[PDB]
Design a protein around this ligand. Sequence first.
Ligand SMILES: O=C(O)Cc1cc(I)c(Oc2ccc(O)c(I)c2)c(I)c1
Ligand SMILES: O=C(O)Cc1cc(I)c(Oc2ccc(O)c(I)c2)c(I)c1
Lengths: 248, 245
Amino acid sequence: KPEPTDEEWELIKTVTEAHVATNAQGSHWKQKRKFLPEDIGQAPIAPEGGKVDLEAFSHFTKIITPAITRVVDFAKKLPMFCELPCEDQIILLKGCCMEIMSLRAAVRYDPESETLTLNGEMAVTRGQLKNGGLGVVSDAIFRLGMSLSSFNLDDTEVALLQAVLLMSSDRPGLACVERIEKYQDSFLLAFEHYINYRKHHVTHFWPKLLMKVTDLRMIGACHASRFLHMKVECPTELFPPLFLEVFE
Amino acid sequence: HKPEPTDEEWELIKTVTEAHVATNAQGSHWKQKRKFLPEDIGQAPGGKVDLEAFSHFTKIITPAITRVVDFAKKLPMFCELPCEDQIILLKGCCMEIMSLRAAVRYDPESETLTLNGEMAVTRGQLKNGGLGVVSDAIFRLGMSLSSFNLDDTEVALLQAVLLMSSDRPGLACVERIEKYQDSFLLAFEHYINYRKHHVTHFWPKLLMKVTDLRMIGACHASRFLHMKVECPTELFPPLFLEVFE
Ligand SMILES: O=C(O)Cc1cc(I)c(Oc2ccc(O)c(I)c2)c(I)c1
Ligand SMILES: O=C(O)Cc1cc(I)c(Oc2ccc(O)c(I)c2)c(I)c1
């Protein structure tokens, strides 16, 4: 099985460093994290269904800007992305923002505590993340977390996965569709070969990881439909500057 | 590189792996043959045992107990021990090994444990089925085992280790057993260096799961006592009674 070529190791070093340089978990999150108090976002023990717990929502939005910002820095550290028109860059960033963020939290899933550590600092439960606003998306991200545990992804693999999510040529309104596909394929090929190098113990690893890319897309779309409910149920004063633009 | 298995250890590894495989009935993956226990059974309504759920479990429990015994009898080291120690070691590790077998068949997607590789149950069905909080402990262990990707050999060696526990009350040949256990641990350690898992501190964390299993085994025993008080005698298969006496 083909391992990465010299040229691909460069790209790999480039994406890996960009990810690590913008991954706030570069200080042992597992040891640094703090658990969000059980009082916040607990089952509310209602007609019309899940109503966003403004209290919980408040804690999530107070640390969401840095997460959004870090996704932009990540893309901006990739030469290929920097070659794209300003218009495409934006379209791509808006389309993958929550996909990438979701991946980042999912990879910080902890079976023993049943939590996801947001921004490598805030540990939360299904209930908390659900009642805080993501609704069933909460369940989706946790499932992704559970399914990714056996994959043992390192920074390079998460970085490459982020880059594949970034170079999505099917986003609506893109100008350089063909060029973006070329970039994505280059990441896929490097990823594919890096995987062979690492030698994971799981059958049909490549095919299974690709399906995870699909889950993230589903997750990204649900985020958007989820944001619509937030706008109805949450007062403007709770929305950070960038958070709004992300779905605009 | 760390020490890999010696020629002699590859022999012990071949023996235990075959014993486990021959007694696990997975020559045809549990996934493509398992059946899900219907949601109305053991559905949410300490606690009181759901006789119907319990009935379903004790209906396939004898074969599981039996395979654990056949696993041990397939190990030459185990056969050199006195009948009395064999009984003690079996009663001591039975639920530990079964719990471990259910835990490696944990499925994140459907959120179930496939018992005997044929019956998929939820954390809820298993709990109301009689195990109470032990169900949580086992599901928990199944969740943490996911990243370890253990193959037949590793689960096999783990079982050999749980089996040869020289600290069980009443054992006569404590030294011999202790020695047998170490032979398995050492070959395990080496087999591990040969596999090369990508989980940090893999060895120490796996050893810690043995700890968890001993705790699960002890909790099942006190869970059994509640069962003897709440479940009609008829729902107890004979071998199920003798093992957990
Ligand atoms: O973990 C990281 O680095 C990134 C990250 C940060 C956060 I705050 C987060 O939670 C969200 C996101 C959107 C949203 O509308 C709500 I309410 C909560 C997730 I999922 C991931
Ligand atoms: O999965 C396997 O191979 C072995 C296995 C088989 C069964 I049935 C099982 O469930 C139990 C065990 C004890 C008990 O008192 C009750 I009620 C249910 C478990 I956990 C494991």
